Structures are given as C-alpha cells and as structure tokens.
Design a binder for these strands. Structure first.
Ligand SMILES: Nc1ncnc2c1ncn2[C@@H]1O[C@H](COP(=O)(O)OP(=O)(O)O)[C@@H](O)[C@H]1O
Ligand code: BEF
Ligand SMILES: [Mg+2]
Ligand SMILES: [Mg+2]
Ligand SMILES: [Mg+2]
Ligand SMILES: [Mg+2]
Length: 431
RNA sequence: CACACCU
C-alpha cells in the first residue's frame, strides 16, 4: 500500500474529562447499565461520557447544541463520542431515532479541525456513505448546521442530479462529503475527486451497505482509502450475517450496543399487528386512515413491497380524494426531493413508499407507520417502524400480516416480545 | 427476489 509514501496524520486527540476519569470500573459498568450500553468483551474502549461538555467539542458546536435545546447526550452518544474521538475503528448499534448521526458527525468535526487545511487537489477528510439519496441529503444538512460555524464545507454526492454542481463542490474543496455509492464510484473513476486525505470513513446504515446489492460498491470505494483511516459503522440493526464481512473494512475495532443485544425495535413505538387475508388489506387500510385522519396529528407513512404497488395504491387513494403522495426509485430525483419536502412540511400528510424511505429518514411529527405489505426481513420491519417515535417522541405502527408472510412470523414475534408488546393471538396461532 | 445503489 506504499506504507511510507503516505503523509502522516493523527487520530487520537481525545482528552478525558476529570468528571469521567474519576469513575472506577464498577461505577463505569453501572453507568453503562443505566444507559443500557454494552461494550463487546475484550475490545479497547474509553469510559462513556455523560455530559456534552465532556466531549471535547469546540465552543461553536456547544452553542449550536444549546440553541437546539439539546440538554444531554443520548446513550449511543455517551459511549460513541469518546470512542470516535479516541480514533478507534468502531461499530455503533442503537435504536432508531436515538441520535447516531451526531454521534458520528461531531467527532468528525473535531477530527477535521485537527488536520492541516485542504489544499488544491485535496479530496475530503471525512466521507459518509448512505444507502439512499434522500438520507445522504439529510445527513449533509445536519453536518452543515455544525460545520458552518467553523468554515467547514460539505457536499452531497448522489445520482439523479446533474454532475456539474457536485463536481464544482468537490473541486472547490470539501472537508465533509456525504455520498451514495454509485455516483461517488463514478467520480472516483473519472478523477473528479480522490480519497487520499480521507482519514475518517463512516458507513451509516452499515448492515444495509454490506448487503448483496451494496457490498461490492462499498468494497470498490474502501479499497481506495488508506488502511490507517478510522472506520466507523452505525445502524439500528446488526445481524450476525454482516459481522464477519464487516471485518474486511475494520482494523483493531470496538463494537458497542445500546439496548438488547438481539434484534430490537424502539420501545416508544406501539406495535399493532393485524393478521388478515391479502384481499382484506384495501378495506382495512381505509378504515385505519379514516381513524387516523380524524386526529389533529396524523402524519402517516404507508410502506408497500414494490414500486408498482406504490404507484397503484397512490393512484387508488388519490382517486378517492386522499391527500397521498408516493416516493420510490422509479421517480425522477426532482420529484423524489419534492415529495419528501412536501411530507416534511406537512402540506401532504400521507406518504406511500417503498423501502427507499425505510432507513435513516428523520421526519418531524410522523405519528403513524403502516406496513401495508410486511417487509422482506425483520430488520427492515424494525427500520420501517422506526420512522415514527424519533428522539423522545412516541408513535404507532400498524402492520398487515397475511398467511403468505408465515415464514417471517417467528422473528416478528420475537421482536414484539422484546418490546413488551401485546401479541395478536392470530399471529401466535400462525406458529 | 424485492428494494436500493453512477450513466
Ligand atoms: N442529545 C440529543 N438530545 C435530543 N435530541 C437529539 C440528540 N441527539 C440527536 N437528537 C435528535 O434526534 C433525532 C433523531 O436523530 P438521528 O440521528 O436521525 O437518529 P438515528 O440515526 O439514531 O436513527 C434528530 O432530530 C436529532 O436532532
Ligand atoms: F436509526 Be436511525 F433511524 F437512522
Ligand atoms: Mg482502530
Ligand atoms: Mg482507527
Ligand atoms: Mg438490539
Ligand atoms: Mg440514522
């Protein structure tokens, strides 16, 4: 890898606060227990922090945090901030809506602030990879909230939008780059950016990015980054099947978890499962929507199995005067952007979507998630229902489960049991 | 598979 030709750089600038350093090992274990933090046995890991002022942040960042009325770091932030700041490779697993984005973005800003300034021809220092274009844009917006107080520049690299403005941003110079894989691979092959200064690599939704469709794109990208980079992977779900594969992209790494070690949903979601025949779904949906739309807070996402079903259900509902719009991978990117912005603003309270909208999206005031079709996996179920109940908010999920979904019943029951939810007897009868 | 993911 030309182990001596590369420039030098530093990774660990973490200074442990005296309020944290004083904790004995037992006291640290009790703090972790109280926050439901588990650090994998045998890994190197700093003590968790428990206040924002422990976390080495620039005063600008603290000012933005206070302006947003953020009082206390979330559990994944409590353990992830110091681990990331220490420069260690890591995997950070915590519930949907629990703050993983800032868990990796704020240490990225510290990391960047300790490196020499970008010159001309310099690629990004921090690269974040995400599975959908809308999620990449959302993460870039979060980053801009905080990097803009320093003079940190960011961009979003993603398909479906003109290449020209993205090439401009990359050539002007960005310290932070958020990307979906395809457009980035395109730009790397054609020399529009490079990863020779990339020392902080984030895989968000990491188990999705390591799946059959994404893993070869990830491999193509990461094979171009120096192996002394820091790599940080994050997700609400971390199935055993991705763990060995993940080691291809990690070095001397540490795994941390919040909540139960098994597959688990956000416990602020009320989870309802309606066992019914496929032919009943239409009527049941309308019944449900009539209830939902009678309430003052009624913003709703309806998930379906295919782009064709998403289009068809949306036409069927709009023809009855329902204010529904849809997002899926066959729409143009300007249309996808417009529909999601209309949903965010509340101008359209019903979003019908494929799994393009299942991960990462943080939309204010979603109160209902409806699985019109049960998803492809129990992990996808956990992510979908996590579009509600963000941060401290509560939410409700309704799922239509048919006999054709029988093979997925066992794991669904386990998820429902882990969350202390009431199980529909028809679901148990299925097994 | 779906579903995402450059052109
Ligand atoms: N320490 C905190 N206190 C309160 N809210 C927070 C905190 N950290 C993040 N949030 C908010 O929680 C919401 C969900 O965060 P996000 O990073 O999207 O969750 P995740 O990536 O874990 O699914 C965001 O609106 C974010 O602004
Ligand atoms: F897990 Be969060 F919904 F990205
Ligand atoms: Mg390491
Ligand atoms: Mg490292
Ligand atoms: Mg879990
Ligand atoms: Mg997220």
């Amino acid at each position: 890898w030309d182990l001596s030709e590369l420039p030098k750089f530093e990774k660990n600038f973490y200074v442990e606060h005296p309020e944290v350093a004083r904790l004995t090992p037992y006291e640290v274990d009790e703090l972790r227990r109280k926050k439901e933090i588990t650090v994998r046995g045998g890994d190197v890991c700093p003590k968790p922090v428990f206040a924002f002022h422990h976390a080495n942040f620039p005063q600008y960042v603290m000012d933005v945090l206070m302006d947003q009325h953020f009082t206390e770091p979330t559990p994944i932030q409590c353990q992830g901030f110091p681990l990331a700041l220490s420069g260690r490779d890591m995997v950070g697993i915590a519930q949907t809506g629990s703050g993983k984005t800032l868990a990796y973005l704020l240490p990225a800003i510290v990391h960047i602030n300790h490196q020499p300034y970008l010159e001309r021809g310099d690629g990004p220092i921090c690269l974040v990879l995400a599975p959908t274009r809308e999620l990449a844009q959302q993460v870039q917006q979060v980053a801009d909230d905080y990097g803009k107080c320093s003079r940190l520049k960011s961009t979003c690299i993603y398909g479906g939008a003109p290449k020209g403005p993205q090439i401009r941003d990359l050539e002007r110079g960005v310290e932070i780059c958020i990307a979906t894989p395809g457009r980035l691979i395109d730009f790397l092959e054609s020399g529009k950016t490079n990863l020779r200064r990339c020392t902080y690599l984030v895989l968000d939704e990491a188990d999705r990015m390591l799946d059959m469709g994404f893993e070869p794109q990830i491999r193509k990208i990461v094979d171009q980054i120096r192996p002394d980079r820091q790599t940080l992977m994050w997700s609400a779900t971390w199935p055993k099947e991705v763990r060995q594969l993940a080691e291809d992209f990690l070095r001397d790494y540490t795994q941390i978890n919040v909540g139960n070690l098994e597959l688990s949903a956000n416990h602020n979601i009320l989870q309802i499962v309606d066992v019914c025949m496929e032919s009943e779904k239409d009527h049941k949906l309308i019944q449900l929507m009539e209830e939902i739309m009678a309430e003052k807070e009624n913003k709703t996402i309806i998930f379906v199995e295919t782009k064709r079903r998403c289009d068809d259900l949306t036409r069927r509902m709009r023809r009855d005067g329902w204010p529904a719009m849809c997002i899926h991978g066959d729409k143009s990117q300007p249309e996808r952007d417009w529909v999601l912005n209309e949903f965010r603003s509340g101008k359209a309270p019903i979003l019908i979507a494929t799994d393009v909208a299942s991960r990462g999206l943080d939309v204010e005031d979603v109160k209902f998630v409806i699985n019109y079709d049960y998803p492809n996996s129990s992990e996808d179920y956990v992510h979908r229902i996590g579009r509600t109940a963000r941060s401290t908010n509560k939410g409700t999920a309704y799922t239509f489960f048919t006999p054709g979904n029988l093979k997925q019943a066992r794991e669904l029951i386990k998820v429902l049991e882990e969350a202390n939810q009431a199980i529909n007897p028809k679901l148990m009868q299925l097994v």
